[PDB]
Amino acid sequence: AGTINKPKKPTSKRKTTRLRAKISKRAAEKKRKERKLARKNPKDPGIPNLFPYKERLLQQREEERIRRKEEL
Amino acid sequence: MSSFESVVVIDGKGHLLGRLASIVAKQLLSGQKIVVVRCEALNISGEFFRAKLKYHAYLRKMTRYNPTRGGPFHFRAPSRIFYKAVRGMIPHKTARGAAALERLKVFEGVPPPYDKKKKMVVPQALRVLRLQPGRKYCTVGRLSHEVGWKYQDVVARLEERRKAKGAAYYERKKLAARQLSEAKKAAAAKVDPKVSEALAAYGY
Amino acid sequence: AKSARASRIKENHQRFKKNIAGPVEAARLERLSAKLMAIAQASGVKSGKSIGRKDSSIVFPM
Amino acid sequence: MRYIHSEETIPVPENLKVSIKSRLVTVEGPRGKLQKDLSHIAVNFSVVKKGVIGLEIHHGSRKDVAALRTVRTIINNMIIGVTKGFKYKMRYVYAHFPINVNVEKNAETGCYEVEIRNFIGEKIVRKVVMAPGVEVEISKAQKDELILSGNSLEAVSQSAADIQQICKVRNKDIRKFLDGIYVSEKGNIV
Amino acid sequence: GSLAFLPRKRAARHRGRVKSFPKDDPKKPVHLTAAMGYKAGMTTIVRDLDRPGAKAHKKEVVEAVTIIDCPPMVVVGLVGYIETPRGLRSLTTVWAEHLSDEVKRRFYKNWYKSKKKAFTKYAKKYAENNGASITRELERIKKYCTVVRVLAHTQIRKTPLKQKKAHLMEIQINGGSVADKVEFGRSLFEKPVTIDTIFEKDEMIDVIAVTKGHGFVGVTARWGTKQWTVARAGQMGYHHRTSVNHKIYRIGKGDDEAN
Amino acid sequence: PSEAGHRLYVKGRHLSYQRGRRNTHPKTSLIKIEGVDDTAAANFYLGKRVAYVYRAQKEVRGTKIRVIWGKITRPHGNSGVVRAKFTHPLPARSFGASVRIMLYPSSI
Amino acid sequence: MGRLQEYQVIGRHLPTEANPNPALYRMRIFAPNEVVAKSRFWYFLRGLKKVKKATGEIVSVNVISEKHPLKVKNFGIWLRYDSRSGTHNMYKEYRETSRVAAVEAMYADMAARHRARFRSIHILKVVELEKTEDVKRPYIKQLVAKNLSFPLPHRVPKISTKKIFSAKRPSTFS
Amino acid sequence: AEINVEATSWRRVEVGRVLKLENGSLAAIVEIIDHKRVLADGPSSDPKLATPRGIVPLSRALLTPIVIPKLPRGARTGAVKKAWEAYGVDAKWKETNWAKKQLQQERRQSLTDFDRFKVMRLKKQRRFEERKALAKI
RNA sequence: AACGCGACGAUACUACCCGCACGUUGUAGACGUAUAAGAAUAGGCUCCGGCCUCGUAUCCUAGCAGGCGAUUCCUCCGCCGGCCUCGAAGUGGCCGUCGGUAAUUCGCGUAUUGCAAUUUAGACACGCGCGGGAUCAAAUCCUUUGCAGACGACUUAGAUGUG
Question: Is Mitochondrion found in the keyword set (chain B) (predicted)?
């Protein structure tokens, strides 16, 4: 493409007031449509493996589980 | 520091085009006369074809009814590429903006009054201090030659002659610095020691 | 067809200029300069060999 | 990720003198002189041992560290051409029209020129001017062979590629018309 | 019509300018590059053609030729030019003594009542010290100028015109060092230059003049129909045109009496 | 002879009025003082007398040279520009004209 | 999020007749001030338990200053952040001097690489790595190299911004 | 094999390298934080050259040619002070051209109006004999 | 380019030029309006010793708004000549004469502007003055031409001539 030698007409990034007002409107009823459908209706990944102290954190989990079992 | 001079002559080599234009436009409106030399050696950041694409987009904008009147006059010279940037940073349609533009003179190369004057530099627009070491840059002289500037070879021959004369001037300058250091050494043995001990205690 | 500004058309013309039309024009210019040569041939400051001065918008008014 | 340090090494043979300015690299040896400018890459040249050139960058990225690999090979290529040189051997083939190849040396401009005649019967002569520093000779060893030799791999390989691109058939069938000049062997003179 | 000749206005001057001399190289011999003449008219010739490949090869062709009357131009001046970032600048013009009254008529709009004092003090600097002002101005051309031109004028008395005012034109010298062409220009002062020496037979030359004027016409004849691009009425003719590749079929002497 | 100078003032430039985007207030002028770059340097010049010296066309009391008096009020911004109030607001054609900033009244 | 400080916030549900001497929970919160630290406490306790500001009271808020704010440490931050897709896990390392400085370095880092906000970042663990082998990321690994020393190429000098015009061109070497 | 390279010669940040800050004081690098921060300490007995131990950005620091030879990494203020006095960093700083030019600025800033007058006239007496020597040369 | 520029010819008046004499003469704004290497920025400069973040540097900087004499000197500045140099919008160097000159030192003046009021001071341009040099011109109208033409405008010719 010879766009360097012969550029085309530019796509203006200046925003018209007419289009700015509609986009705020269309963003509004999208949020209403999303809320209406959610109203209509019909997880922890864990400690990372690269964490250097997952082993001493797991034994804290087992030790507190023993104390909870002993208390109960 | 901050000084008011009669005329500040700026060497345009090594300067970014827009960063130099905003500094110059502020001094012109503040009441400072500015001469810029070597506008074929200014830099515009980015790759060369981006500066060429911007100028080819500028060349598109031409009026339809009569190009001789009112149309955007596309100036190809490197001095006038710089002058276009400065004129867009000045209210040139008022009397104050017109007065600020008359305090500016823009030249290609170094004209023979200004090759014996000292050329200032602006650290706030210098390419080596501002740009990242890996980025690409273009020269205004290269962009001008590809859009119709006819006097790249003429300015290059005159600059070669100007630097041939300046090499002669530096050779006389080195001799003066050699002779000044020899004269100071001899005068240190004939000066009264109370004069030199007082000057050393005062930092001079 | 090929344009008048085609690259291969220009290269063919450059081969014509150097090899055929070149020495023809150089020969005719030697004769014409010879006839022009026939017609034309047919202190320091006091002699003017040193060049001095005869008989302002670049500098701001100082 | 901004690696703090990265370095590579170029060994230097005993018969060579490598001189490096700001980023201008000059290699001298038996066969001649080679210079090339490297101001487009940020690099710190240094001397590590008696015959080792050290090239380093500091606080570069993965892109800047990888640009050290291209300069190590580029300087090492200048070492080889100055010591051993480069040789490209090219063969020209034909079916019916014999290709006449003529090599002359221009006294002015100091460069060889190769004239190709009678390429599939065409009456146009094809003149290729070589790079300064590459010599072309007709092989009196095998049939239809040229030798492009020199010190710069850039000059030898580009001049060899110019000959291939100037003898290329047009508007024909590639599967049937096999005429052309092709690079057969690449290597060193020594 | 063509948009290349778009400002369809009357030509600014009657004579019309060259606007481009040939590109100069110092290895060539010293030669002038242009001349002047007066249009006489046209005639009919028969040429024995030698055009291999033509249907009229080795046959007789009848062609129309144009006759331009060329009295010998008289060289009166020398103008030096320097290279500039702004373009090309004239630095020094050196005239000669004994300027004719014909070219002196050119610097006057009313010659019949003037005192004819043009170049009277310039005739005195050739004998003021020894000619120091003249030699200084030529040395300024030799050491500073990049190309030099020659001022030559035609004579109207040799031509059958009621005009008496000569036509003065600058002609560029090509092919040599600036020192060599200056010594041509000073030696060529006060001397008639014939068209035998400037041009030669069998040579394409470039012809520059102002066309025939037709005054105010409409779009029927100005454009050739059934903003700038819209066909509008106005002036047709008296435009400056540069024509290209016209062959010199003959150069008559005028003395020969069998032209 | 002497071959010295007689300057007992600090040079200044009249930049603009007090303004925002579009509304300008001529009662306060903005002055750039030679060699000031922080508010700390501008604090020395507070209260110092400012003179704007210009030229007229008619002699009035033995002079053709007229003066408008003022004093420095407060620092402006972070760059050492200062605000100055005069007995009459300065002319709008003097944007970029020089002023004389004098060391009286002196607290040193 | 500013000059953060670590806070020890201890709060409890309001004492009632059914349950006197209540549970007394404790958290460590990085907050700009006292008032924010209480708010983050009740926000985090509301997600975990059914204790809010209306039925709860703050027992103590104390600032946990660093033991050694003059010793260089390698820190490990385990965090969750919320994006358009959902909740993700990261573990990032920071070579700093204080535990608060590692948290400030983390907030600027997550805002830079991933455009994460303060409202979306959950800091789970800030651990000082006692031993050198515990450092896992290569950008900290090159900092803990033996005999670490490097130059500083292309150093732009600190020229005052009011010095518009300079007489000689600057140098980027020292 | 001849290699002739003249590329650069930088000072390196390292443990034991003495820095100069914008305040005019001296610090010595103890441990390196990152590529633009270091931990330093100036234990000098001169109040003009003393710096508290802490984090210093390298953008606010200047690298002096003085390196304490075998300073341990992570050394506390007691060990740095012993190596500071043993190497004589204050004496080596005084001989540096950076401290000589700084002392020149301190003396020139401290001139009174009377001292400027005596500076100017004593320069004229010194300039006179420089001018006679230059005319002889 | 009808508000871009260069070279050259003749320039009557007026005053074209030189010297010095002053302006109720006009300014987008004088007050030390002082300062030439080139080039690189992952390198440079150098007297070849060494030096480089840094123009917070260098020069100049004292005397009724700034004398006359002395000693001491060829220190600094300026005007005119000769030799040369300087064309990108054109200048500086050397030599010489003359004048001024705290580099060291000295004798006699300043008051009253009354406790501050721009320190009327620079530059270019524009005028008026003398007393001296120099110069003795063109264009338009009118008549004519038709290479031109709606009118203007354009190519021409009108002073003794190849009219």
Answer: no
